[PDB]
Design a protein around this ligand. Structure first.
Ligand SMILES: NS(=O)(=O)c1ccc2o/c(=N/O)[nH]c2c1
Ligand SMILES: NS(=O)(=O)c1ccc2o/c(=N\O)[nH]c2c1
Ligand SMILES: [Zn+2]
Length: 257
């Protein structure tokens, strides 16, 4: 149903998901001069050493690398967060051209892609309950710029041939998501939403200041994926990003000055 085309894209989503016009929608433009440094924000705690990746799935909108979230194996804590959030999956949003693709923007600048490491608050028991709560999710967002290759990403790139079309999945064990992080964990944070339907307003967004660099060949391989299923007309999976939404009554906070 919904997607990213002329006839089903972000400007249409509000007709089935009226919260698309809500008070805390994501993504947003991060105006760096307007964000407020909050010296009481704690450093992020990323504990991924016990992460257990399971599978990679083309869901028709992006690809998801899924993790075992039945125990506290890969968790995000600290920063603006209270409690413990478990990593359930990561995915990306990217463009058809290197000058677009990210969901968040920084002083209106678009990056080539954006990584979302999705975590849910363990006090709610399961991801489906968590998305119903204003503090249910924490998504760690990391920008990708085109330049040198990111070695930690290559294993992802290399399996994409096996999940070209919607509904395909492949075993994807022993992937270490720590290899996708930049050096610095300086971040901006604001309350927001899922950036795809159902657009639920359940996300504490934590967007890293420092982008990672990926090579032109790496992002080109993202762009060879397909939104369609096998045996349907080929539509390249590109430009699967929602544009920046109004900030409304929200202040973006920075962990760094
Ligand atoms: N984007 S949305 O509100 O879920 C949307 C927009 C246009 C649509 O056309 C449809 N017939 O296949 N479904 C649909 C959903
Ligand atoms: N793109 S996003 O805001 O990180 C995100 C994260 C988890 C999600 O689950 C979804 N369907 O149940 N959509 C979705 C978007
Ligand atoms: Zn996302």
């Amino acid at each position: 149903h919904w997607g990213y085309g002329k006839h089903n894209g972000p400007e249409h989503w509000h007709k089935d998901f009226p919260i698309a016009k809500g008070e805390r929608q994501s993504p947003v433009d991060i105006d760096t001069h307007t964000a407020k440094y909050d010296p009481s924000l704690k450093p992020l705690s990323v504990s991924y050493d016990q992460a257990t990746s399971l599978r990679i799935l083309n869901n028709g909108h992006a690809f998801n690398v899924e993790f075992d979230d039945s125990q506290d194996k890969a968790v995000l804590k600290g920063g603006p967060l209270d409690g413990t959030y478990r990593l359930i999956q990561f995915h990306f949003h990217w463009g058809s051209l290197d000058g677009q693709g990210s969901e968040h923007t920084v002083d209106k600048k678009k990056y080539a892609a954006e990584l979302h490491l999705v975590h849910w608050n363990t006090k709610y028991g399961d991801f489906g309950k968590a998305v119903q709560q204003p503090d249910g999710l924490a998504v760690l967002g990391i920008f990708l710029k085109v330049g040198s290759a990111k070695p930690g990403l290559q294993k992802v790139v290399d399996v994409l041939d096996s999940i070209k079309t919607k509904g395909k999945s492949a075993d994807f064990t022993n992937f270490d998501p720590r290899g996708l992080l930049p050096e610095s964990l300086d971040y901006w944070t604001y309350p927001g939403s899922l950036t795809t339907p159902p657009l639920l307003e359940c996300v504490t967004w934590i967007v890293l200041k420092e982008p990672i660099s990926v090579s032109s060949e790496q992002v080109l391989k993202f762009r060879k994926l397909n939104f369609n299923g096998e045996g349907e007309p080929e539509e390249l999976m590109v430009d699967n990003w929602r544009p920046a939404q109004p900030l409304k009554n929200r202040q973006i906070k920075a962990s760094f000055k």
